[PDB]
Design a protein around this ligand. Structure first.
Ligand code: 6EU
Ligand code: 6EU
Ligand code: 6EU
Ligand code: 6EU
Ligand code: 6OE
Ligand code: 6OE
Ligand code: 6OE
Ligand code: 6OE
Ligand code: 6O9
Lengths: 75, 394, 394, 394, 394, 75
């Protein structure tokens, strides 16, 4: 009774097994495959650089929360 | 007629003149409308005349004042004229009150059948269901057949309302609000009856809106009682005046910032315009989470918008809406005792037209020849409906 | 009597005439009620008469105006007549005030024993507990025996209230509100005393409601003071008028949409009608989570209902309730200084009937033969209670 | 002139005299301003004179009353003088109304281009983008070029506003509020056009504020309509009067306790002053979590502050702000029908100056020599603009 | 004196007589108080007399009306008498205004030193800190020594307030509210200076309350300005009248249900009375989680209490408190222009007593012998202080 | 700089390592040892019996949420 990947969920039938198909929310949703879990690629902001305005902070450093936030290693 | 044209235009003093004239003079007593039989202070029992006040042949003075489409701003001629503030009370307490609670009982009985025929729906399968011989299986197919039959009834009685009195051109909602919500309830169920035999599983989505709306339409019947009638009136004005005019002010903030948030950050929870308009509706409703945990490019800009959103639509706009709703609540509760009587007159006039055969109950208080003669003849006939008053002259 | 019948019907001017008559004329001075002893402007010390004003033999003029069941709408004859605005103040500041704070002290002492006898209840076992010889174990069985003895006292004093003055037919709550909450507190504890010796572990469920209600009944004693008495009055009107009439308007939305949500989606958190009515009560209260994470069939319909629920009962209905409560708060705070005095008179009349033996304190301000003669005799006797006024004639 | 000086100072009765003078007397009829052509009760068709009322050469009586900077407190001379309550209505319903909805249509068209040119921005790369030959790629570079061209237009038209009428010295915001928000929108976009060709990725942070502000500036056009115009006016007064004066009262509580919390506990979520001011803004907004789970040194002190923060700025201050906003909402809705007409006159006078060439539409209702002679000559000429009134003399 | 006794009792008309007497008659002109030098309509420049109005030797008419402890209910004799509505304005705009902003500047400078001397406190080490020769280490020990020196100053100036004018017996808070909050700030810091040299790590708990209170005391200086002064006044009345009388009504619900919840269920999050009063404070504040996940014995009873708690103290009581606060906000904003002037007069009289040496600035507007003679002598002397009025006699 | 088990936390110093010492909340707290994780002992309510009024539901069955709730095994 499932709704296949690409078919309309959230009205008639829900999506199939959650290895692949999430719904999503956008009011006429279509069961979409997940993307691959990719890490922080290029154009990142390194440690001591400004995060939160231009670029994300990289994988091993938080931004974390300031007005002009600089990346930092964990304690 | 000049009497109906005074009623169809909101003229109390012209209409209070015609209903309470007492022209005591030879060759002028027959011209009068009120005949005071006797007076014994402060009691003054006076026999009136019901020539075009209740006589449902032509446009009677009651069918005109009730069906007047929210203009003619001198409404509530009921308690302001009063040979008919007691005609309505006579029709209510004798004939209409018993048939009103019967209608409210059947509608409660209809909704219990319909809320139970939906609570026990079969889950598996999408096609129209054929049930086997079960004591509970046969008793619910009767329950579903009765439920659609109600949705047929409110459909045809709703079209009958629109054809009989043709409301149009932004008078469908101001007057005739509560008659179209029964019509929308009916056509959610007829769409549900189409999608059921169309073998679509999405029939229950239409039936559920027919069931939530069916219970909220049960406070149609609160409208008409003295105490609990104010709640159904101010839930109408807050939707039609307050929330409808406000939802274009709010929606330009919602669509304004949600198109801003989507182009700012492209990640989960805000990738689409629809999911962003829901998360920004949750912030102005108060039920949102300002957790700025996850890392975005343009995270620090995102905090400045989302705080300038929350301070601007949860503090300003939401409390501005509550302040405007609070004015129309306290305005409509001061004028409560006035606002009550017109809804009963709309119900008392409707229930009299529903039978259309019990003309013995349609007349009020007997025929009486109280003129004694005419300007030319010596015989007369009138429908009196006396009423005893208590006013004081010192 | 004509004096009590003016009091039992709400007639100030008829009652202010009889209490302040001064018929100074031969064979008419004995007819008078107020005797002005001397006047020295603006002071006017006048000796009144207490024949049926405080005399508790028949229906006195105070027991009639206090026990009048919320009709006779010219109430607060206390500050509007005033030979008895100072009779109540005389009974308070001399006799009743000291016995009132003693009753409030014992009730605070009762609730400290009862909140401590429940805080140290034994947890294991379901049978009636037997306590060995412990300094804390013996001191709490005395604490539980005193606590039930209070619940016996408020039970019999509550039945004594209903038999003495028989309130009935939708006057039990409007008047006599605060006397039945002590009665409900008592019978939660007597049910708790039944289930304890019935070896049921569910006795503490009845005792806990007797303990939460026992502390909220402590603001019975706020009622009667000038400043803090308004809070106990408007907590009564908001429950009885506002929240009680509103909870049939709200409950047709709650039961309407919760039967809609259950038949729409059949999964956890909304499988039953009870758990769905709790999650939809949490949305209108504001304390709900509109997290649309988990996947349902009919998920997109579910968001449309639940947003049309939240926008309709958290924005319209809840703020409509707050606007109606806010009117009855600001209405009852304008009329505050009036609303205060009737609750003390109900307390001052009750505490005088509690002793029923101290008749020396029951009279006010001595006997005095101020008539000098009678219409037939030459001797007289009256109970004077003089009062010095400060009114100004230029 | 004495006529403009009455308008530039808020003098109704002096200005209602000059516009409605009828000096019928030989060698004095030419002195008059209103000429009653005929009267047929209650209709009184009177031809006025437009010498300095609409004549845009010098300081006309309309350009003076519209551009008056929020002082001269006898404003709304429109409905209080009325040879010009119908001059504005004549200019609106004939010439200005069609060119107003065209401007509102182009601005809606501009924002749809601009909200779509930003929704489809390229994500990768920081340099100014070059687009290959694509049907969607060419159609969006036209979309971005049109969007900046609008931001150039509101920039120069905004400077044109400041140079033409020089508002200054705390009159920039009270009057001329809605003209500087279009100017701030423009310069967020010009900063965005600088940072785009400066190869900075942070151009979209300026564009997003230009896009959220661009949609909220669309309720400039609500200002001017009778019903929906009140919402744009009270959103201005709540920002300028209420929220601006309050945000120094609140900010000394926010900065007061956030410097207290930072020095008290030195751990995550409160290490910095910025992150502490956000968590304490979330508590007064209601959307904060008082979960006291994690262990701090000075944890028990931290609960006492944070409860004395929440009880002090979420209960006192936030509801004090809502009570002050609610006063300025209900004050500005009583005076609604007055508040509406001045914003149309500011729009009707502006749109007439925008063309500056259609002088055939600039005059109103033709030339007419209704004087018949002069004090010295026998010929005359005037611009009449008759109007039929309905006032009643018994 | 009869002049001060009129001021110390709230008698406008008696005091407006004595300050504006003009007894023009031989051997009676010397008796007068106001001398009209010349009149030129509508201007009337009149030289007054300052004999006990500003003369700070005895109880002057200003030190009496300012220091009057919130009784004498005809206060705001400032704008109701007015030879001294302009005496205060003369003392302000010439002498007191410059020394007031200097005091506000030093207090802002004191709080920046104190909020920075606490932001950079050493974390490790229970004992009183010793600082080595560092540019930042020496600059903060100066910062801590200046901060305690301020706390010494507000301590002794606070005791000086209590000894000079002895406020007592429930007048310490109604009047003299804002002077004891500076005193409480001081003694949180002196306790902090004790616990620092007592080698207790808990010194920062007292210092933090001295620092949060130090910034919220900065809106003492808002009190005295016309616009922003209303916010400091209504934050006082809401604490003293509204929130203080309400917190005994609420606290019997909090302690009532929290003793009910503890004895009902004995598990985590509700084991103690303290942690239960916090979770039930979070429900009435709105910021609580009604997640009924975890299994209790008496779980179904617990849902009935906690819903009968939330519906009873978050719907009734919290909105009842907001409705009472909203009345005292809108009452105190109507009477705003009156409420402003008394706080400046308390500041203008205090700053004049602070110097106690600049007697050249203490006099106002010079000596003048405007009597010309006396009843016995031919010479005189008075302190005039003329003022030009604008009142109109037709 | 820790506060030992039995000493006052939440004012001067926090508790030690969280194997033993939680604070708790009760305004003058004392670092208390955890109790042992004990399962559902006797006086429980079995499956199909009323939970949530008299007794807890046992370890392998939810109550879960009703007015008169009966225990049930998981699906
Ligand atoms: C025909 C209209 C205009 C209407 C139809 C439905 C969808 C409605 O939403 C609205 C739009 C709406 C949606 C969400 C929040 C508010 C308003 O308002 C009513 C309409 C309005 C309401 C609320 O108003 C009422 O039903 C109460 C009521 C008061 C007085 C009445 O006379 C009455 O009819 C008897 C009903 C409840 C709903 O009918 C309902 O049950 C559901 C599920 C949605 C509500 O559209
Ligand atoms: C006898 C009635 C009508 C009543 C009994 C109890 C259950 C009550 O709930 C109500 C119903 C209710 C339930 C939940 C929310 C609101 C109302 O209102 C009172 C009743 C009402 C309240 C609130 O009102 C008060 O007790 C305050 C009060 C004000 C003035 C009084 O004179 C007074 O009596 C002295 C009490 C608190 C409770 O008694 C309470 O402690 C608990 C646990 C429930 C409340 O039922
Ligand atoms: C020029 C000023 C004074 C202003 C510019 C912007 C930043 C603004 O925030 C404010 C400050 C502010 C920030 C956050 C909350 C409230 C106020 O108020 C307006 C300004 C105010 C608002 C709210 O007011 C409006 O735009 C509605 C409005 C009503 C009447 C109008 O005539 C009008 O102009 C047509 C706009 C929305 C913003 O413009 C907006 O879209 C964003 C993102 C921020 C708002 O600064
Ligand atoms: C001396 C009293 C009565 C007082 C002292 C402190 C603890 C206070 O809490 C109160 C009790 C209290 C606690 C929590 C919430 C509300 C009230 O009210 C004030 C007192 C009251 C406030 C709020 O009132 C103000 O400070 C604003 C204010 C308005 C007018 C003023 O003249 C003023 O003094 C200049 C201060 C803030 C605190 O001082 C503060 O900074 C902290 C941390 C607690 C507040 O106790
Ligand atoms: C009432 C205003 C609500 C605004 C919501 C909104 O903008 O959504 C627009 C569309 C959503 O369509 P999509 O799911 O395809 O959006 C994908 C965005 N790239 O949905 C619609 O067109 C109508 C949605 C109405 C639901 C209440
Ligand atoms: C409107 C009041 C908001 C108060 C916020 C605040 O005090 O922050 C101060 C600074 C923050 O700078 P930092 O990120 O470097 O903070 C580090 C603190 N040691 O940020 C600023 O200077 C201005 C921030 C304005 C953002 C709305
Ligand atoms: C203002 C009312 C708040 C009610 C809180 C309360 O009842 O707590 C009572 C005690 C708590 O002492 P304990 O931590 O030892 O509680 C243990 C309970 N068995 O704490 C106190 O005595 C005073 C606490 C004041 C903190 C604001
Ligand atoms: C005041 C309105 C609250 C509505 C709650 C409601 O509909 O529940 C109905 C029943 C629940 O009984 P159940 O637990 O057996 O529900 C199972 C549903 N299939 O419970 C009841 O009958 C009375 C519940 C009263 C609790 C406050
Ligand atoms: C008021 C909005 C109603 C929208 C709606 O129910 O859409 C349902 C859906 C059903 O069509 P479908 O047969 O499932 O075709 C797509 C196959 N997955 O329709 C579409 C386009 O697929």
């Amino acid at each position: 009774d499932c709704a296949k990947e690409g078919e309309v969920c959230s009205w008639g039938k829900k999506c199939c097994d959650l290895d692949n198909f999430y719904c999503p929310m956008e009011f006429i949703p279509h069961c979409k495959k997940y993307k691959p879990y990719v890490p922080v690629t290029t154009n990142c902001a390194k440690e001591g650089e400004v995060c939160g305005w231009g670029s994300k902070c990289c994988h091993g450093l938080d931004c974390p929360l300031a007005f002009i936030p600089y990346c930092e290693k964990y304690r | 007629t000049p009497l109906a044209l005074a009623a169809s235009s909101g003229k109390i003093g012209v209409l209070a003149y015609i209903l309470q004239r007492e022209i005591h003079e030879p060759e002028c007593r027959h011209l009068s409308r009120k005949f005071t039989e006797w007076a014994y202070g402060p009691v003054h029992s006076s026999l009136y005349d019901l020539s075009c006040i209740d006589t449902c042949e032509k446009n009677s003075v009651l069918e005109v004042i009730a069906y007047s489409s929210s203009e003619t701003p001198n409404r509530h001629d009921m308690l302001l004229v009063e040979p008919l503030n007691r005609l309505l009370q006579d029709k209510w307490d004798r004939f209409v009150k018993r048939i009103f609670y019967f209608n409210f009982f059947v509608y409660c009985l209809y909704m219990i059948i319909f809320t139970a025929a939906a609570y026990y729906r079969p889950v598996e399968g999408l096609p129209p269901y054929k049930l086997k011989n079960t004591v509970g299986d046969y008793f619910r197919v009767t329950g579903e057949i009765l439920s659609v039959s109600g949705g047929v009834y409110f459909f045809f009685r709703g079209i009958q309302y629109f054809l009989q009195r043709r409301p149009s051109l932004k008078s469908l909602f101001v007057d005739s609000y509560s008659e179209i919500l029964f019509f929308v309830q009916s056509l959610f169920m007829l769409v549900s009856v189409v999608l059921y035999f169309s073998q679509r599983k999405e029939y229950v989505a239409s039936m559920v809106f027919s069931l939530a709306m069916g219970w909220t339409n049960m406070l149609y019947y609160t409208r008409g009682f003295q105490q609990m009638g104010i709640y159904a009136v101010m839930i109408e004005k807050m939707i039609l005046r307050d929330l409808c005019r406000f939802m274009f002010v709010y929606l330009v903030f919602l669509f304004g910032f949600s198109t801003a948030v989507v182009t700012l950050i492209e990640d989960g929870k805000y990738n689409s315009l629809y999911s962003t308009c829901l998360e920004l509706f949750k912030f102005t409703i108060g039920m949102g989470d300002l957790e700025f945990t996850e890392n975005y490019d343009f995270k620090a800009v995102f905090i400045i918008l989302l705080l300038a959103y929350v301070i601007l639509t949860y503090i300003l706009l939401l409390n501005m809406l509550i302040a405007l709703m609070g004015e129309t609540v306290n305005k409509i509760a001061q004028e409560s005792k006035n606002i009550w009587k017109l809804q009963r007159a709309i119900t008392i006039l409707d229930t009299e037209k529903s039978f259309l055969k019990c003309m013995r109950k349609a007349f009020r208080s007997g025929k009486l020849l109280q003129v004694g003669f005419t300007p030319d003849g010596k015989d007369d006939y009138r429908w009196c409906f006396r009423v005893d008053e208590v006013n004081w002259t010192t």
